[PDB]
Model the fold of this input.
Amino acid sequence: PVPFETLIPYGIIIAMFGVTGAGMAKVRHMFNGDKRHRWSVDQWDKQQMERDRRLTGHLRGQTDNPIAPPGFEFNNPWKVXXXXX
Amino acid sequence: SQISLLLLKEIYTNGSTHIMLDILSVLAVISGICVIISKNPIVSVLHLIGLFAYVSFYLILIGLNFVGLSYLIVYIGAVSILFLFILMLINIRTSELQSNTSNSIPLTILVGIIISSFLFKMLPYGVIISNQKNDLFFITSKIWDGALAENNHISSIGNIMYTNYNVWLILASFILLLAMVGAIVITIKP
Amino acid sequence: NITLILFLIGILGFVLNRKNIILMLISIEIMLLSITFLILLSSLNMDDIIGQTYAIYIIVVAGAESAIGLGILVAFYRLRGSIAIEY
Amino acid sequence: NTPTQTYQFPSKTVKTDYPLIDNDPHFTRVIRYARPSDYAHGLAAAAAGPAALWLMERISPSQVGRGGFAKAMRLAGFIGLAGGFLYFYQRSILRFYGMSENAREVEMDMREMTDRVKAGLPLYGE
Amino acid sequence: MASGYGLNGGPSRCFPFWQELLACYVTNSSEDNPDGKNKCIPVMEDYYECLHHRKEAARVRALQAAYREAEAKKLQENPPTAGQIRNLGLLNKEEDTKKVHCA
Amino acid sequence: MSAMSIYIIFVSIIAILFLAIDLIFAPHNPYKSQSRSPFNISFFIYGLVFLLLDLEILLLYPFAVSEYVNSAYGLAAALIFIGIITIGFVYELGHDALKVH
Amino acid sequence: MATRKPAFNQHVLLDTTPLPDSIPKVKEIGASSAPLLSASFFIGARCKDYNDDYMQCKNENPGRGEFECLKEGRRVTRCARSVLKDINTHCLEQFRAHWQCLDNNNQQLWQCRPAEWKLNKCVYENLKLEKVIPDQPKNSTPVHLRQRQIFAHHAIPPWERPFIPGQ
Amino acid sequence: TTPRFWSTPLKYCRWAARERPALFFSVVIGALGPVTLATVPPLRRLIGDVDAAPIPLTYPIPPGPRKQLKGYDDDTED
Amino acid sequence: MSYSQTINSLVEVVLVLVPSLVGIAYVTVGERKTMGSMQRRLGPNAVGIYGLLQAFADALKLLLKEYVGPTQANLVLFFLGPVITLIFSLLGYAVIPYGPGLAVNDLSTGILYMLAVSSLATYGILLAGWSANSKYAFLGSLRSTAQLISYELVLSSSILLVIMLSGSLSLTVIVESQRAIWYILPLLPVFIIFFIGSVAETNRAPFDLAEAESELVSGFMTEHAAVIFVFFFLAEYGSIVLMCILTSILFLGGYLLINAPTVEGSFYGLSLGVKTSILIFVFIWTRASFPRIRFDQLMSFCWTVLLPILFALIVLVPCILYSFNIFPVNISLL
Amino acid sequence: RGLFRPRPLLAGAAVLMLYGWYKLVKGIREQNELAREKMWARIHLIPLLQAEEDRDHVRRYLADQAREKGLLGENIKVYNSDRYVRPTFAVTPSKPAQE
Amino acid sequence: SRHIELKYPEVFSHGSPFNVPAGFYPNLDHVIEHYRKQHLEEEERKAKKLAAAAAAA
Done:
């Protein structure tokens, strides 16, 4: 027959992988503002996310207004560090 | 009357703390000192491995991930295993390797002052920018044309490593070849 | 500056050492790592991948040289039984 | 159709005796412009290797075991073939460099390369 | 550095200075006139400044001392807060943008 | 505080707790020259050939993430490098320095 | 502010000083990454010449391209602004569907073909702009016009069809 | 017993495949690289399998002079 | 971002490490039950309902057991190697993508990171054997270290072939690249070699001389007492699971399947788990099926069979990628 | 049993390998085509993003020159060339914003 | 000699072809014209030597 008590630990192992998958996807989704996350982000994507924030306030915020709001021309972030150049 | 220059903390996209560079630097010197004052050569190599790790972690935190991981894989993972192998097999009495370090103390002091004073003046302003009120700050911005398709450091090396500078690669292969044949010829029975 | 201090430590290995030739190899490895550390930080300051490439070849050569030196030491230990200088 | 830019890259100028044809000629040009004496010189150079080894054996025997000399002759033949071929290649390519008398070659390159211009071909290929 | 290959796969940031230094030397130095390479002196200084930034560091700290000296003399009755600062140029925060800009 | 940084903390904390339990709760009581023999050269050789071969693989990893740009020209020099290092492997096999029999 | 990638930044420095009146003022683009990615090929259609001109001006003025090309810099902004007003006048629904799909799909274009095909049809029949990708392999179908996307997490509905202009 | 390659090459290759398979086919696999380099690209051209053009990895600057454009100037603003 | 970055990082690490250790706990339970069923017996069915508490009883027994160290050689050194081994054996979970970019660290050098942490774990075994202050036990630990670095070369050589197809060291890219095809079909011999190398890398039977009491001089792992045994046992079973995850990533399509955020995540995690559980089963299956290989023959197998084949494939594969115009782009795409 | 004869196993292995390579040719070619589209999409955006960044650098370079002449009385010359060099250092206020 | 002639003038063609900012590379036309002249002068010197000193014999 089929020894199913032998299979129960495999079901536990598979289900733990399911919890990590579901949990990671959920917490990232909430972190990005009820939005799917970004992955494999290069320097171009990183810069585009900073530009989105200086338009909306959120690194994931979107807007399609063809005109920038006032003060956008002053809020471009120049990053400051002490040591490692 | 307004404050045209504005400074504020960065919330996300923050970046690591430069404090961690200070802890790693003192861990390297402590482990380095422990290398040359340890009684047992095996324990000396353990402190040396520790020194490799701190330098390797240092390189990773400043963004030199590929080279930093290469140190872990190659120096810790291969070179120092070979060192531990031979040391842990050969017969060693610690009494035979321990000299009176006190007789070396004045020469130690003199050599340190002479060598450091000359070698420090040779360092370009980049490496001495942040070591020993009016603190200077590095500022960075973005480009778009430069960032069209960024390479990771390992890809930038790979772009030139086999084509522009491949003479170095050939030369290194010959050294590896010679090392393989040489170490075998002097150690094994034919 | 950290690389300078590390180079001193490797230099001091010879100064503080009369009888331990295994420490002699280790001091050479500390000096090589110190010099490679200095090249790597300078090439990050000067935005030059060639400096990183130089570091990679020093690592390879330092690894190959450790292989030869451990081999020579083994050919020496086989006839002697000690790596200790009677000083 | 002159491209209005007939010298596009900074090249190293080298003092030689004969006109420079090509400082980096394609492998097939070097074979095609080879003179019949280049084959003669290259073959004789190749044979010299195993012939020298054979001569050493006949005058100063190596006292090697049964199959040792055949193995050394196989390696000496390959060494001679490599050195003979490199010498053959050098003899031809030195005329492309202008480091050796090259009048037949200057004519041939002028003949060949003018023809590609009249066919609309790129001078050196694609 | 001078190689022409930066960390991100692009060219190295000091390469244009190196190319110009080599350009100045090749076209001004010669065997007939060896003193033409004196024209290269300012370009060589620019290449050394790109690598190591000594002159720029000396200027910025000289200026920052003056900037912080004058900033202490003035009185900030109501400097912008970081929260108002973080709302600069945002879609529905015109009040904070005007306050930060003092307009 | 990043996920990677927190991860190393938690993994190390796990190791501390396990040490803590056995060093706090498990019973403890302190229950409490040599000869020199020759060692086998085979163990140096394993580490030797590992180290040199591990260095050669590292020098090929940039090629695997740079193939599109390297194209035919990079492949040629990568193949030359591979060809040179496999000759040294042929020396290692042929001389039976792994103690085949 | 250098192009070096920062690793220990903890602060941001902003300057409130405006441009001098000697410089003509242009209004900046107010569109974020996902909308202008979904408008990128339409910007590339109308504004190719000005885009190229601005990059040619800068190459003509090495080391000084920033300061010597501001007027051509302003023309690029106004041409791309004209496409974003035009799309927001004629194709707003299909525009929003595409970039909201992109913004949920790691900004990967092969995960949003049905929305892109909808918008490409709408943009073509209003603003007469065609998506064009240079140097695509001639033997194969262009990748953005393929019914099936091998790398799409969601398989594509058979009914949703690629928009070939002029069909 | 064990054949010699330079005496009878075909017999040696038969023995090597059966007696040292790992080393023999490793030599065969390694040799297929150069063989496919010399055979497949020639055949692909014959069957029309054309190589794709390189994708841009830098901004594609147009050659020749600038186009002397008029439009979207400062008078067009607002 | 929406809530605190520190909170986000805490929850993600908890979501990976805690379920991963539960998985490791039940792999040891499953190994005994599966080998039991193959052996016409049951296995654990008493400690807990259906034997599901067996691994926890074993761990709690071992943690409350007294530890016997060396003859006061060095207390720090005695624990250092075991601590090193466990920490660096669990570190490789931090780059495992449970879905696209769904890793603790979505690293562009992720594959190199796994290779680095694995080579740091080998030190603890060498270090532990030296601290035993026993000649015979050290030679076994030394022989074990020789096996681990040798078959580490096998895994590194195998991985390079996979990187040639994907053009990337990022684990998410390697998986997304396999929407074209699972690499097991075009790299089928590489997958067999990589699986064999992962069993040898983990000191698992038929390469289990580290734990072989029957052999005269082998079995230095058999001398690890209470808390040290827990460390090495957990490090090993956390390495077996990680090897089977990494094999699923590299050759079995990773998390790929054969609209809500939670459901899509659950399926990707479940898909990776099924592929990992299957390879976990194969690990157990081979241990029950074969006798032990001698140390001299296992080192000959690595150096005169596996590596010569791998380095031949290192020549063939990129020649094939060039010949068909299929060298992949190395830009950030997938 | 035929399940363990090498000949059908070898044939089965080869077909799986042949199928996998055929699919890999189709996958990497279409993946290379997707990369072409992604770059051209970025290329069309680069001038409008770069012009915006170019204006910002122009603004702040001038503001720094106005600061220096106002504060120090004149402008210190860092480079002898007339070229624009993106700053490595920046004058910062002694404190950050309060909140 | 005080002037240094480059052993490797082709170093003027070095530089990464990827991620090039607009207006990054300095103009090198005077440099190429310098080496065009160096090449044309040398060819003339050989031309006026094996065609003028060869008419004697």
Residues 68-97 of chain D form the longest helix (30 residues). The helical segments of chain D are 27-32, 36-59, 68-97, 103-118.
